[PDB]
Structure formats: C-alpha cells, structure tokens
C-alpha cells in the first residue's frame, strides 16, 4: 500500500487551480512591478527638481485602497486557499490511512481463505457497521470544503467588484497642500496623475474570475456526499459466502474506498467471476 | 514493473512540445524586456524635465491591447496546455496501472502454467470482455486531446492575428491633454510614439505559429483511437492452447498494452516460436 | 513505527500559522521597500541640489520609533514563536518516542499472547502507574504553551497600538538645523515630509492581529490537558483478561497515546468485538 | 545490468557538443548585454536631452534583422537540437533495453548451459531472424541523424551569412522623421549611429561555425549504419556446439550489441578460448 | 542505535541561539544597507558637482570605528561561535559514540542473559572503573563551554560599549582640506555629516544583548558537570544479582548515558519491577 | 567493487587544475567588470552631454582584440580543457571497468582455490595475452593527453603573448569623425582614451600562466606509459603454483591495475608471504 | 567501517579554518564593494561633466599594487590552501582505506580465534614490518603539510606587509596630463583622491593575520610525526598469546590506527582486562 491517495481526484485538482493560478497571477504582477519600477505616474511643474516631484509621486500615491492592495489580497487568498489542505493532512489524513488499510487488508485475508476453503474441500460488515454513528470525518471534511468555497466565493465578489470599479477615468487628481504647504502658490491647486498597472490588473482579474466561477460547481458538487455514484464495491464481494443517503462518515470512507480499489488485487478476480455469473 | 509508461510516445513529445516552447520564448521575451528597460519611447519636446517626460511615456504606453498582453497571454497558454496531463495523471492514471499490472501478470503466469503443463506431460480474455461495454477511460483520454487541440488551435489564430496586425506602422501617434491639461498649449497636440519591442515578437510569434502548426496533425492523429494500428499482441499469445473499430475503452486499453509489451518476458518466446511457425 | 507524530494536531497547526504569517508578511513588506527604494519623502527647497535633499531626507528619517522597527520586530516575533518547538524537540520529543513505542508494542504483544492462549486452550497497567507523580512532560509541554501564548499576546498588543497611533496625520514636520547649520536663513525652518510605507503596514497590521486573535482560544485550549476528552483507548483493551482530573504527565501521554493508535492493528479488532458486545 | 548504455559513444559525443556549445556561447552574450547594457548607440545633437536621445537610440535599434535576432536563433537552434535525443529516448529506446536484455541473458544461460553439460558428460539465432525484415529501430534512429544534420548544416549556413554580412562598416545611418517630426527643421535629418556588439558576435560566430564545421563528418560517418566495422562478438561464439550491408535494424541492433559487450561476463572466457584456438 | 545524540540537549539549544542570532541579524542589517545603498550623509555646499559631494561623503566616511566595522564583528562572533561544536564534532565526538554503543549492548546483553538465566532455572561497572582516573573527555568539553562563554561574554561587553557610545549626538563635524586641498576658500572648513544606520543598530544590539545575556546562565549550570543530577541509571539495574563529585570524565559519561535511556529497552521492564519493588 | 577508479591519481588532480582555475580566474573576471561597470574610459569634450559621452566611449571600445576578447578565450580554454576527460569517460572507461572487475575476480578465485586445494591436500596470464596487441586503450588514452598538453600550450603561448603586449601604454588615442560626421569642427580630432580593467588581467594572466607552465611536465610524464614504474604485482602473485617497453594497451592495463589493487583482499596476504620469503 | 576517518582530527580542524576564513573574510569584501561601488573617490574641479570625473576618477584608479588586489590574493591562498586536502585524498587516502581495514578485520578475527581456543580448550606484526622501510605513505603526507604551512607564512607576511604599508596618509595624489591632455591649462595638475576600502581591509588584515599565526604551531606540532604519543594499542593486544622514532610510515600508520580504534569491539574488552591485569 504505497499508493494510498487519501484525496478525491476531483478535490486534488480544484486545490491545485484554486491556489497556483493566484500565485503565478501575483508572480506577473511582481516582475511587471520591478520593470516598471513605479505604480503611478503625476505631472509635476516645471519648475520642480526630481526630489520634488519624487514626493508629489509618492504623496498622491500615498493618499482606491482596492488597487494599492491588489497583490497582497491575492497573495492572502492563494494562502488561505492552501490551509485547508494542510488542515485536513494534519488533522484527519492519518486516522483514514490506517482504516483503508485494514479494511484491505481484512478484504484480501478473507478472499485468500475463502480460496482456501473452497479449493480444499463478518469482520469487514461490522467494522463497517463500526462507522455508521459517528460523524467525525464527514464534519473535518465538510469543513475543508466550506471554507474553500467561502475563500473562493469572497475572492469571486472582490475580482468582480475590482472590475465594476476600474472600467473607466483611472487617472485622478490630487491635491499636495497639506499642512504647511498650505500658503504658498508656487505649488500647484491640483495636479493630474495617472495609476499606470491598472491596465494589467484587469486581464489579472478577469482570468482570475473566469476561473473561479469555472471551480466553484466541482466545489458544490463535492459537498453532496451521499448523492454521488456509491455502493458498487460490496455487490463484487457479495458472490463469497463469508462476505446510503445520510451524511455519517460510513458514506465517505465508502467513497475513499471504490477511489482506490487499485490495490485490491482479488478485486479483479472477483470483477471477471461477476462477469461471468451475468 | 518498475517502466510502466502509461503514456504515449507522441502524447508525451507533443505535450512538452506544446508547453515547453512558450515558456523559454517567454524567457526570451521577459529578459529583453528586463534589458531595454521599458516598452515604448516617446518624443517628448525639448521644455520637458525628467519626470514629464516619463510621464508622456507611461501614459501613451497605458493608453493596441494585443501588443501590451503578449507574455502574459503566452504564459497562459503554456499553463493551460500543462493543466490536461495534469488532469490525466490525477484522475485515470492510477486506475490504468493496475490493469496493466494485472493483465501482465496475468500473462506470465499463463504463460508458465503452461509451460509447466507442458514440459510435465480463460481469466484474461473474460476480463478483457469487461472494458467492452464502460466508455470510461475514452473519455477522460479525448478531453485531454480535445482541450490541447482547442488550446493549440486558439493561441494559433491569436498568433495569426497578431502578424497580421503589427506587420506595418507599428508607431503611433497620442494626445496627452486629457483633464486638467486640456487647457495649456504649453504641451503638444500629438506626440510620435515608438513600440519598441514589437520587432522581436513577429520572431517569437511566427516560430510559435510555425511549430503549433506543426503540432496539430499528430493531436488529430492521436484523437482517431480504434483506426490506428492494434491487434498484433494477442495474435502471439494464441499458440498457446489455454489462450476493433467502436470507441470503448477495450481499444484504448489494447494501445496501451501494445505500447509496453517490454515488461513482458513470455513475449520474446512466443514471437520466437510464431516466427518458427511461418 | 515509522510514522509516530509526537505533536499534537491543533498545536502542529496553531505552530505554522503563527511562525509563517510573519514571515510571508515581511517578505511582502521588503519586496514593497526594494520596489519603492525609501521610506521617506520630503519636501526639500528649490534651491537644493540632489545631496542636499538626500540629506534632508535621511536626516528627517533618522530622527515615531515604531513606524521604523516593524519589519525587525515582525522577524523577532517570527523566530522567538519558532524557539518553543525547537525547545520540545530538543528536549522532550526523544524521550517521549521511546515511551509511545515501548507501550504500543507491549500492547501489540499482550494482544497476541492472549490471542494464542484462548485459540489453544499487568506491565502496561503498571507502567502507566509510574508516570503518575513525575510531573516531567507537563512542565515542559506547558512552558512551550505558555512561551508562545505570551509572545503571541505581546505581538497583538504591539499590533493594536500600532493601529492606535498612525491612524491619522501620518506626515510630520521635521527640523533641520541641528549644529552648525543653526545661523543660516538659506534652509527652511521646517520640512514637510511623508512617511510612504504607512499605507500598506495598516493592512499588514490587520491581517495579523484579526489572524492572531483567532489563534489565541486555541492556544487556551490546549493549554487545559486534563479538561479534553481522555480515556478512550483503555477500555477498548479491558475485554482482555490480561488487561484523570490532575496535572500530571500521565495525562499528557495518555494524550499522545489516543493521537496515534493508528500504529496499533490490534486495536481494530478490539474495537470490532467491542461493537459486537454493545 | 544496470549501465546500459543505449547511446553510441560518437552519437553522445555529438549531441554534447552541438548543443552546450550555443548555450554557454549566449549565456556569454547574454553576460555581455547585461554589461554593456544597450545594443546600439547613436549621436543624438547637442540640444537634445536624455528621453530624446534615448528615444533616438531604441528608434533606430527597432528600425539588419540577422544582428539583432542573434542570441535568439541560437537558442533557437540549442533546443531543436535536444529535440532528436528527446525523441529517441521517449519512443525507442525502451523497446531497445528489454531486447538487449533479453539477448544477453539467452547468451549467457546458453553459455552456462553448455559448460555443465560439458563438465558433466538456437534461440537467440532464431530471435536475431525476427529482427531481419522489420524496419523499426533503423527508421526512428535515421530520423535523429537527419534531423541533427539538417539542424547543424542550416546553422552552419546562418553562422556563414552573418560572416559574410557584418565584415564592414558594421555602423549605419539612420532616419528620425517618421510621421508628425517630418517638418521641423531642428531635428537632424540623419544619424550616425554604431551596433557596439557586432565585435564579440564574429568571435562567436567564427567559433560555433568551425565546431560545427568539424561535428558533420562524425553525423554523416553515423548515418553509414551497414558499413562501421561489425559481425565480432557471434564469431566468439561459435565455439559452443550450440551457438550484413542491408539497412534493416539487424544491422543496428548488432551495432547495438557489441557497443555493450561489457555486460556480457561469458565474452570473457569465450576470447580467453578463442585465442587458445588461434 | 541511529538516534544517539551525543549533545546534551541545553547545549545544543544554547549553540544554535548564540550562533543563529548574529546571522539574522547581520542579515537584516546587510539587506538594510543594500535598500539604503550608503551608510553616511554629508551637506556638501551648493556650488559642489555629484563627484565632489560623493568624494566628501566617502571621505568623512572612510575618516567612531566601533559603528563601521559592526556587521564584521557580529559574524565573525557568529563563526567563532560556531568553532567549539565543530571541535567537539571532530575531536571527541566519535571516541564516545562507539563507548556508549558498547555501555548499551553491554547492558541488554546482561539482562537478557539474567532473564535467561531466571526463566531456566561485572564488565560494565569494570568498564565505567577504568574511566575514572583519565580525565580526557572533561577536557575538550570544558574548553568547548569555556570558549563558548569566553566569547559571549566579549560579544556582550561589545555590544554594551555600542550603546554606552552611539547614544547621543550620533551625526558629527568633519574636515575636508587634507593635503593639496588646504589652501582655496571654495571649500568649507567643515561640513555636517550624519550616520544613517545608527538607529537599528541600537536595535539589533539591544536584541543581541538582552538574549546573550539570558545565555550565560545556562553555559554556567553547564559548566558545572558534577553538581548536576547524576546516578539514577544504575540504581534501576542493581535489581538484577550480576549487575560522583570530583571531575573525571566518568561524570561526563555518566552525564551522556542517562542523557539517552531511550535506546535501552531493558531499563523500562527494570524501572517497571523498580515500581513494583517499592 | 564499488571504488574502482579508472583514472590516474595524477591525471585527476592536473585535469582539475587545468579546468578549476580559468573558471574562478574569470569568475573574478566577470564580477569585478559587474563592479566596475564599464571597460573604457574616454576623456570626452565638455560640451558633449551624457549621451554623447557614452558614444564616445562606446565607439572607441567596439573599434587590441586580444585585450576584449579575454573571458571568452579562458572560458573557451576551460570547456576545451573538460572535453577530454569527457571523451575518455563515454568512449574508454565503461570498456575498463569491467576488465578490471574480470582480472580483479579471476585472481581473488585462482587464490581461494588453491588456498583450498593446500589445505585440504593459467586464465589470466592468458587474458592478459589477449591485450598484447591490441592498441585499442592506448589510443584514445594518448588522444586524451595529446589534446589535453595541445590546449594547455596554446594557452600558455596566448596568456605570454598578452603579458608581451600590455606591457606599457595601456592608454589609446581613439578618433570619432567616421562618416557623417567628418565635417563639423566641434567634436575633436583625437580623444585620450584608458582601458581599465588591463591592471588585473596582468595579475590573472600571470597566475595562469604559472600554474599552467607548473603542469605540463605532468602531463608529458603521464603521456610516457611504459617508462613508469611498472610489473610489481605479478611477482607476487607467482607465490601460487597455479599462477614491457612497447606501447601497447597490455602495459596501461598494468599501470591501471597496480594503480588499484586495494580491492584485492589476497594481495595483502601474498604480500605478506613474500615479505616472509625474503 | 563506515566511519573510518583517514584524517588526523587537528589537520582537519586547521584545514578548514585556514580555508574556511578567507573565503567569509572576501565575501565580506565583496559585499562591501558592491555596496560601496567603487573602491576609489577622486576630487574633481567644477567644470567637470560626469563622465569627465568619471575619467579622472578610473585613470586615477588604474594608475599601490598591493591595496588593489588585495581579494584577488586571498581568494588564490584560499584555493591554494584547499589543494594539499584534495592531493592528499586522491592519491594517498584509498591506499590507506584499505590497510587500515585489513589491520582492523585481522585483529578482530585473531581476538575471535583466541576467545574461541580458549573457552573450548602472526599476520599483523607482520604485515606492520612490511611497512617498515617504504617512506611511501609519509612522504606524501609531509608534502601535505609542507605546502599548507609554506602557503600560511606566505600569506602571514604578505598580511603583515600590508598593515606596515597603509598604516599613514591612505590617500594620495595623481596627475591626469598624459599623452594628449599635457598641454591645455583647463585640466588641474594635481588632484587629491582617497582610496576608500583600506578602513576595513586593515581590519580584515588583522583578523586574518591573528588566526593565521595562532594555527601555525598545529602545523608545525603535525608535521612532527614520531615525536607524538604512540604505541598505546599493541600493548592492550599482547594480553593474547598469539599477538618508534624514525620517519617511516609505520610510525604514521600506527597514528592512524590509534585514531579510529573505535571501530575496534574487541578492543574494549581487553582494554577492561587489562585494568583487571594491574
Ligand atoms: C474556541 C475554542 C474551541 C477549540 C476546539 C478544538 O481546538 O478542537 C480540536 C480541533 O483540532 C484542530 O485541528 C484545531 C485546528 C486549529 C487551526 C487554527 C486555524 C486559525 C483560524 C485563522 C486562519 C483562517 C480537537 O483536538 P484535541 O482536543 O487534541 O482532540
Ligand atoms: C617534473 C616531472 C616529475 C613527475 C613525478 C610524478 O608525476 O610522479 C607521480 C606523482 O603522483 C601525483 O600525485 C602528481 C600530482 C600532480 C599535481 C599537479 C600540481 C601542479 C603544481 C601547481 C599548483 C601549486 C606518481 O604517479 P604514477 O607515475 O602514476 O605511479
């Protein structure tokens, strides 16, 4: 048992998206930065030195709060979106590992000795049965999946407020007399400065909302345990003669057990000798 | 069973044709970028200070789109076309080695039972009979093809579009008097403007317009499953007396078993002896 | 016994996030300095060359304090909220592995002898009776908890104050003639000058104080070993006929001992025939 | 056997050399462009500032096409040169191993076969037979040679061309009034303008075209698979009593075979018995 | 026996403080000095080009030395903190390694002989009797702690001096006219110049003072090898009938053989039958 | 056999010597001219601005080659240097190593069995016949130092002929009128012009020609293959009873096997039995 | 015998503190000059452009020897005092593997042979008498230590020449006029120009001086090889009764056996019975 996966495919694949696609998006955004150098562009008089129109630069930019904050909010979600995996490793990975094992374990012991038996002349059910009461890995599991989909659905409003914000007129004016500037007219009233990234941020946000609307159905049908395809693994084993629509974690362990039955080796045996009995 | 490919050889070399070829001309474009500095250059008139005529630069550079999104829409297509053997590997990768594991083992030991039978004195075609009827892993395999074959045939017509828009005048003219500045005849009606980069793109466009029409034939090729060429492996097994045209996955699983008959030592004996046969 | 964890998953989790929050959010905030090169911006005369206003610049930002030392401090509490895992691997971890696997294999090895004494025809009791007034574990287990419980309670009290104070007017005055330069009326009496990186240390700010105060009841949780839920696993094992209120360590370890009896096979089959006894 | 070789010695050599040299001669001219920072410098007039010069210098840099496209192509040319070895390892060199393994475990039990029936008292001649008329392994390996070749021949005819372009007067002049400047009279109407990296490209060029000059006999001596010097190592054979101009990989697969005859621990004794017999 | 430490467990603590302290914080330091780009500013006068001024700040740079040689100090007190474990990883390190191998086999070979002895029916204290007039393995220790505290201690004195110096009036006066340069009245008798890192070194030695002054004690308690907690490890095997003030190195053995009980399976039966007996 | 050499100890350390040392001398090259910048200095007008300025200085540095042209040259030499030992290891050394094995083998069994056949009571001399007239090693052998002593004289000849240059006058005068602008009588007829990186290229090339004249009398001893001292391990081995001038490979077979017979476990004993024999 | 060390632990230790430290000591260095970036500031007149100053500064620069190449010369005695390791363990340390493997083997079997003659009741003296006259194993180690300690004085007094050179007056004059420039009267005749890294290259003297002779003594105390403490290990052996002053390599052979009888398990038993013999 190396191959044990302990994650739904579906699962693994809509982590994987939901976090490398922020980070190569905030990665792009970081190497534009350190090309471009700056993040806004004003016109300053003429008859400012650079270190003047230095301070008119980073006084307006320094004076909405969405475009400043743009990287930082998709870095914090890629994060936030790569706990719950880490969560789920730590707290409820390693108790299932075990149980796939001696329910595998017991299945081939039990193929082996009723060949045995039958070449020569139920422990499985009850553990089964074991885990029908309990509600203890469906809720860690329920859990990793609600916060993904809040993560994803909070990131999916913000990248959709983002573009319902900076569509049009992303130049601005700004005003430089505060404090005790405030006397002098050798500075100007207003002067018109232009945010210079936005231009990128809006591939950046579409792409990056595309995608996320593209996830979120996988999302939602994974939290439906019970309705999905089940129970198709224990009509193989019922031709030995020693041998679902609630949410307890019998409904789950039966999902992660038909994800791998590749390491039942008497399962293929008794796949050929159904197909046979048809 | 150490080699087991569970790839085709032209699958694999189309995928790392088709991913690998857009990152290093992005490599490329990325590291000119970071040498020339910026992407446009600007005549400024000569009253101009430092920071205005930064300022005229960057605001015709983010004032078409095509141009200004090229590494980034490249990028993208490299990650878009590396998502499908992701999902290949994820998904029906693990439920394909153990049926090759089990039909090679399979093999061997029929192989010697009878050989022992033999030199002293039908379990794989009913489980072959099993994947006549499941179109299972058809069609995980034709959404990998046909996801690379839209992808490939849509970045081919955007690299197309792009030549067949910056092929003359790649310069052009920009007002800068939008606001406050729409007043003062101290600055220009129209400034000449430069794209500077836009002689190396053609480059690394028609190589990538080149060799994505190059790739495109053996996508289709790869897609026509049950009329490639099949059948030869079960015709050497059949000296042994104990022992294709629809798109089930019975053809599939029959390519690749035909692809790795190496890991097969029963094979080289039983061509041997077909070959005494003719 | 290969994977035997030696930490709980609460505390392995609650670990992470308050040592690598930290150091993601200054490597955020010294990306943003290389980016924008200062700090600070002032507002020099006319009349001043760029040395001149260099120096005006670094003498008004050499001279509140807490502005200046956050990403050092953010660090510091990086690596002293790191120092107490450091501190139980070192000193406690060894010594508790040696004792989970001294009493998962003696379990191991009761189950069987008592398996082949029914099917042909106290030690562990008393070796939990001596680590009942060690109080060895405890204390060491406790002072990692409380170490970073305070670390963790300081760090948000630096990060609430610092909210509390640059909140508003984040500019400031600054005085340059300080020695020599005290008779001249070619330097100005007072500077305006903007701190620049105060916008983005607000949202840095918040992130980590809301994060650390969601930490925080779970370090409280854990801190109260004898009020969780214990002694599950002892009277699984009271179906053999061979065979907790205080701060002792034989409370601790029976902690540690309920987080993996993953590694103990017989404990299925206990927990099996205990089903079957209800 | 674990130091299969499944490469030609002179095959491996070639490759090597035709592609890390390009690699490492523009990983010097990559070097040499982050040194000198710009590829051109032109003589801007007096009354020009810094943006108009520099508007000047990247005007006329984006105004032949083989000069500036140089590191580029011979990237260009190191990958499709990695191309054939990538090809030949991904689709014919596993079906190789297993034969190759197959042939030297037959030698070697027919060998130890013979000495104990020697000292107690044709399978691979039938499986070399198969491999007479197939027309499998000569095909794929000639498409490596070709393509190698070709690859090699048209870089040697670019790196030829740019000797015989950029000999003289490697300055140029050039033209600034396209568009709006096309009627002032204080903009020049040419300037002398000078490509500063043309003196380090012909050192690059002379060395990759005389390397290259002396790699093509060594791929055209490969391409002459039936007439290397063959048919050794069954003549050594031959001693036990129980045991090539055509283009079928027969030819190939002996050439194959006796590359590798280290592997072979009965070749040996057979030579020892060999030079008694002589 | 893989996890035999050979370091106790508050040393080991103590080495990684006293050495990875100083490279953080002369990490932090250098990447401060790398975004600041110099470490002193002078106000040269008007009249001065960028050379001058920059030979004015270089040469009242390179003109008290306690705050220029500051980052060298710090890592040259974290290198030569670093020495003393790699002396006592190459000196004496694998001399005891192979001693408490042989004290451990030696001791489960006893009682396992005992327990067979019992069932069916002095080397060790000999051995510890030989090391109890050599003093060898005291030696290189106490240099080990000594050289420890030596320098921590200078460091401390150092790093005390730092603030008892740069507390005050951290800018100065400097001379320019050295030389050809004393004679023209261009140039100003002296100029004000102010050190601009000054105020994180107060920091980052106020850090480095407080944590090495909390070091010591435990290198003191270390240093005290015989009035530690010593001889509970015989006690538990004097129940089997065929089986410390001054500073030998049978002290320090002893030190090290309880240090790691762990590896002994014996003494937890023998600590059990210890519990029993009282 | 796990370290089986096949390579001179000699060969080995003048191989690394002859690669390691142009790799770090142009390392140090290439890192003081990323400090330095430039490699030129001209002594422009003071009517020219910083644009003119720097096509001054570029066009008198792209118009001797020797001097321009050195990191290339040394990192030429030190890939052609690496060459050889390349060729030696994918051509030679897999045909080496195992007939060493054989040789290595046959004679630890010639001596366990007559050991037993004293106690209890010619192979290799004819395989050693075998390589007498073979000329197969020694050619590639002689290929590899040939080129090896070929390389390190034309460097060294280089590396003296620059020293015999840049003797004296480093300084040029450089002229700027080529072309359009051999008319105006503003720019100068002749600008002083300084190559600044030719102080430290004397100090590399000195180094390098050094150690370079220091190797190659090893590499001339090395190529003298039957004039060393050889045939010492033979005459020990005619203790059993059961058992070279000219340049064939019979005589680098010995040197390559006394060069290693710390593999042979007999040769100690045999050598001992001969020490008692004399 | 994994952990056999062929290294005397004080050559060890000095080895990598006389590498160890110039490397750190040149990284220092080189930090410092590209933070610095350039190493020299000269006092331009005022009518100079930037790139005239420039000039004056890199003619000035490149126009004693000793300050400007002082990273170049530690890095070669870095290098160089790394070579005598690396001679030493290609050519001399496989060669004494082995012996030292066959002496350990031969006394464990002999102490097995005599355990078990006496309680159911010479090889190694000779094979030490072969090495009595060979000077083979001790000349090369002499060579080891002859080339480190000849390479450490040299650079001791090449360090002390540099602290008695630049104690005074660092700074110094140069003259620009040479060549064109001796005739107008615009250039000044003499310029004052400070060198500006010899602050800390006098600190990075010390520190390397200091260290350099404090190693010194280890170096001529190693290469005093019959004048250490020997012959303790044969008299632990003459307990069975079956079984140093000139420079031969037994004397050096038996300073490497008394090093490593760690490996030795019989060794601890007859050290105990010979504290029972006194
Ligand atoms: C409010 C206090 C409730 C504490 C509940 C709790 O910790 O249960 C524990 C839950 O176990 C866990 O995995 C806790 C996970 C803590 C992760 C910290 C997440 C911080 C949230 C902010 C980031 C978004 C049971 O462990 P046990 O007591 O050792 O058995
Ligand atoms: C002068 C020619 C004398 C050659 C002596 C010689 O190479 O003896 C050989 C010595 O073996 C060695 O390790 C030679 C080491 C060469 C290292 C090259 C050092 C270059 C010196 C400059 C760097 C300071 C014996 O080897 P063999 O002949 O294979 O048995």
Redesign the interface.
């Given at each position: 048992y190396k191959?044990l996966?302990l994650e739904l495919?579906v699962d693994?694949?809509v982590s994987?998206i939901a976090v490398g696609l922020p980070l190569?998006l905030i990665s792009?955004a970081?190497?534009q930065?350190?090309?471009?150098?700056?993040q806004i562009?004003?016109?300053?008089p003429?008859?400012?030195?650079?270190?003047?129109?230095?301070?008119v630069?980073?006084?307006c930019?320094?004076a909405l709060?969405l475009h400043?904050?743009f990287p930082?909010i998709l870095?914090?979600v890629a994060?936030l979106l790569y706990l719950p995996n880490?969560?789920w490793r730590?707290?409820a990975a390693?108790?299932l590992?075990?149980?796939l094992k001696?329910v595998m374990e017991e299945l081939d012991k039990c193929y082996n000795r009723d060949i045995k038996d039958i070449k020569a002349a139920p422990?499985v059910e009850?553990?089964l049965?074991?885990k029908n009461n309990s509600y203890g890995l469906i809720i860690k599991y329920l859990i990793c999946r609600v916060v993904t989909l809040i993560i994803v659905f909070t990131a999916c409003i913000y990248l959709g407020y983002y573009i319902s914000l900076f569509s049009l007129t992303?130049?601005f004016?700004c005003n430089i007399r505060?404090?005790?500037?405030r006397n002098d007219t050798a500075l100007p009233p207003?002067v018109?400065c232009?945010l210079?990234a936005?231009?990128?941020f809006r591939?950046?946000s579409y792409?990056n909302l595309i995608i996320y609307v593209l996830i979120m159905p996988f999302i939602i049908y994974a939290m439906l345990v019970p309705f999905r395809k089940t129970a198709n693994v224990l009509k193989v084993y019922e031709v030995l003669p020693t041998f679902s629509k609630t949410y307890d974690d019998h409904s789950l362990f039966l999902l992660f057990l038909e994800e791998?039955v590749?390491?039942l080796?008497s399962y293929?045996?008794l796949?050929?000798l159904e197909?046979?009995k048809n």
């Open positions: 191959g996966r495919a693994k694949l994987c190569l792009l970081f190497a930065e350190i090309t471009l150098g700056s562009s004003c016109f300053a003429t008859s400012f030195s650079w270190r003047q129109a230095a301070y630069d980073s006084f930019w320094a709060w400043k904050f930082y870095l914090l994060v880490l969560f730590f707290t390693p108790h590992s075990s149980d001696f422990i009850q553990y049965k074991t992303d130049e004016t505060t404090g005790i500037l207003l018109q232009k210079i936005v231009g990128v591939l950046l792409i791998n590749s390491e080796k293929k045996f796949k050929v197909n046979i």
